[PDB]
Ligand binder design. Sequence first.
Ligand SMILES: [Zn+2]
Lengths: 8, 745
Amino acid sequence: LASLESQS
Amino acid sequence: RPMNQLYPIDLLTELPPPITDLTLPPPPLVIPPERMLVPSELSNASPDYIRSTLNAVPKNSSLLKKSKLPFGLVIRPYQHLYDDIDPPPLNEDGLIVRCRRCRSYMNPFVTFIEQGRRWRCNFCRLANDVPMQMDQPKSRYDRNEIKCAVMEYMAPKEYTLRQPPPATYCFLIDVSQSSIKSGLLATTINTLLQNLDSIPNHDERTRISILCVDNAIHYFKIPLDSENINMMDIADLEEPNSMVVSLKACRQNIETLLTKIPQIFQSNLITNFALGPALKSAYHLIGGVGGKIIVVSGTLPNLGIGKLQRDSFYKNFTIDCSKVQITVDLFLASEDYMDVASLSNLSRFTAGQTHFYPGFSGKNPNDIVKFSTEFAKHISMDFCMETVMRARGSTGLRMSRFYGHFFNRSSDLCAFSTMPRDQSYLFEVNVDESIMADYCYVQVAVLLSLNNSQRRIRIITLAMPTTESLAEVYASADQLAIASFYNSKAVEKALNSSLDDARVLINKSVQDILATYKKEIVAGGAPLRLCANLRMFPLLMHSLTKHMAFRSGIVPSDHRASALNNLESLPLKYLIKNIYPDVYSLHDMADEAGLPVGTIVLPQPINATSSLFERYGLYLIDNGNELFLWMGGDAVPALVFDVFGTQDIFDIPIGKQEIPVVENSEFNQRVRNIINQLRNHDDVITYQSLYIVRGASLSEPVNHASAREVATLRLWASSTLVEDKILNNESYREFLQIMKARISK
Ligand SMILES: [Zn+2]
C-alpha cells in the first residue's frame, strides 16, 4: 500500500 | 528573529523540583508569518499531533552530534477514542496537490512563484505546476491544505486497490476451566452483552464473529434475525458464511448466543487452550477482508502449535497477518503465569494492543469493574484498516528508526492493519547533508480506510527553524519529547539487550546532556547547570529507572513485560504521568478542589516524595495505572470520619476497594469527586483501581495477618514516590549530586 501512498 | 532564548538555571537550587513544568507546553516554534501562506495558529502543526525533540533544528550533522540531544518525532495521528471529537478539517473535492518528485502534499509552507502559476516545494525545492483546479466564491487560499498544518482528505479512487472494508471483529474467547472459575468468561460475555451497541457501526456494515476455545475450537453459525443455536466443534487442531455475521442483521441472534455460551462450558473441566490453532482458525475466518482478532484469556497456551512453558510461531503469525490486514488484541487475565513478554508480540507487530490483569478473580467485585470497563471502552474505540503511515522530511532530513506497535521491516513505511486511537509513536530523524535553508520540514501522511467505508488521507505538516547556534538548539529542546525518545530507546535496549544496559542507557542520556551543556556553554560556586526548558529531564530519566519496567531487583516476568509494553505505546501525556505521578494533598485541599467549576477541580500536585506525607494527612496518588489513597496513621477521628464513616482509623477499608458514600459529608463527596474525575478520559480505556493504604501510627495495635497484607501496600505505594531513596536506588537529590560528580575534573 506504499505504492498507493507514494503515488509514484 | 524571535529565536527562543537560553534561560540558565542551577538544578541544585530547584529542590524539590518544580513539577508544574510537566504541564507546560514545549518551546515555541519560531516561524514568521511570511513562511506561512495563511498565518494562523492552525498554520503550523500542534504538539498534540506532533512534537519534535528539537524545535530549532541543527543546521548540520556535526552540530547535532555535538548537542547530544536526540532528533525524534512523537507522532499521534488521533487524539480521542471517538472520531467525532475535535476532528481535523476535512477536504472532499478530491483535489490532491502533490509534488511530482518527493510526493509530499500541498501545505502551509509551499511558495507560489510566477504569478501563483507554479509552486516551489518546501521539501525538495522542485518547481511544480499549480492545477488550474486550484482556483474554483472562494480562492485557493481558503483551502485547508493551505490554511492548516493538520488536515484530512477524501481519497480519490486511485488511492484504493479494493473497496473499503467493513469493520470486522473476531472474538477469540477462552472457555477453558481457569476461565470459568475466575469468571473471566462471564464478565467477558456480560460486557459484550452490555455494549453490542457501543461497537462502531457507522456504516451498518460491522461484522462480528465468535470463537470459544479450550482443547477444541468452538464455532457458531448465526442466522439473520429475519429468518426465524448451532455450535460446530473441531478437535482436529491440524485443520465462513454465517460465521462472520452482520451485527445489525443478526443482533437478536448474536445476543441469544452470547447468553447461552456461559451455560455451555459451565461444567467444563478441560484445562486446555489451543491459542495457536484458534488463531489460525480466526485467521482463515477473516483473512479475506482483514480485521481484528480480539483474544480474551486467563490460561497460558498449552496445546497445539504455539504452546508455551514457564516462542516464535507468533512472530510468523504476525508476518502472515501483515499480508491480510489483520490486527490482534489481547486481554490476559489470571493469577497464573501468562507470558506477556511473548504474547505481546502478537499485538505489537500487528498494530494492536495487549492488556494484562494480574490477579484477576471474579471473587473481587472490583476486579470485574476494571476489566469490564476497559474491555467495553476498547471495543467502542474507532479504528482504521489497511492503513500505512510515512513521515517525509525536507532535503537533508531522513527518517531512520520507527517505534510503537505496527509492522515495519525494511522501509520508511509503517503498516497498520488497523490503526487504533489510544497509542502514540516515534520516529528518529537523521540529518545527512547540511541544510541550506533557514527552515526544514517534516510531513506525516496516513493513507487509511476509516470504519465508515471511506478512504482518507490525514496530513500533518511541521515547520521548524534551523540554526547553527548550540545555545539555540538547547533553548528549543522539548524535554518531554526527548524523555519519550530515550524511553523508547530504553525499551529497545532492554527487550533486546538487557535491563541493566537499559538503566545504563537512561542514566547516560542525562549525563551526556549535563556534561555537554557544561562544556559547550558559559561567577558562582559549584552549581549543576542546565537551561529551564530541560529542567525536568534529569528527574524524568532518574524517575524512569525506578519504574517497574526498568527497576533493579525482583519483578515478576509478566508485570515487567506489561510495564514495558505500556511505556512503549502510551501517549506522551500519559507516559510522563506513568513515570512521575500526580500526587494530591487532600486533607488541606482548597475549597474549590473537589467541586465543579460537570468537570471537577483538582488540587495542585505536590512532589512525589514521602517528606510531604504528614502523618495526619490524606494523599491520593495517580500513576496512570492505579490510584492510591494513603491516610496518615495519626489521622484525626474527624478526618477519618468524613472519608469512611468511622472514627476508628484501624477500622478503615484496606486494599483494592472503593470509598463508601458518607451522606452529609461534603468532603466525602469531594474525595469521591476527584477520584471519578481522575477516572474520566476520552482518549484511553484505562480504568484505575483504587488501593486504600493505612500509614503507621506511634501506637499501632496487633493484626499479624493484615500486617503482611498491609506491609505490601505501604511498600507498593511507597515505591511510587520516585523522588525518594528506594532500596539500592538513591534519592533524586542524591542522583543530582552524583551527576555533578561525574561531569567534573
Ligand atoms: Zn518535492
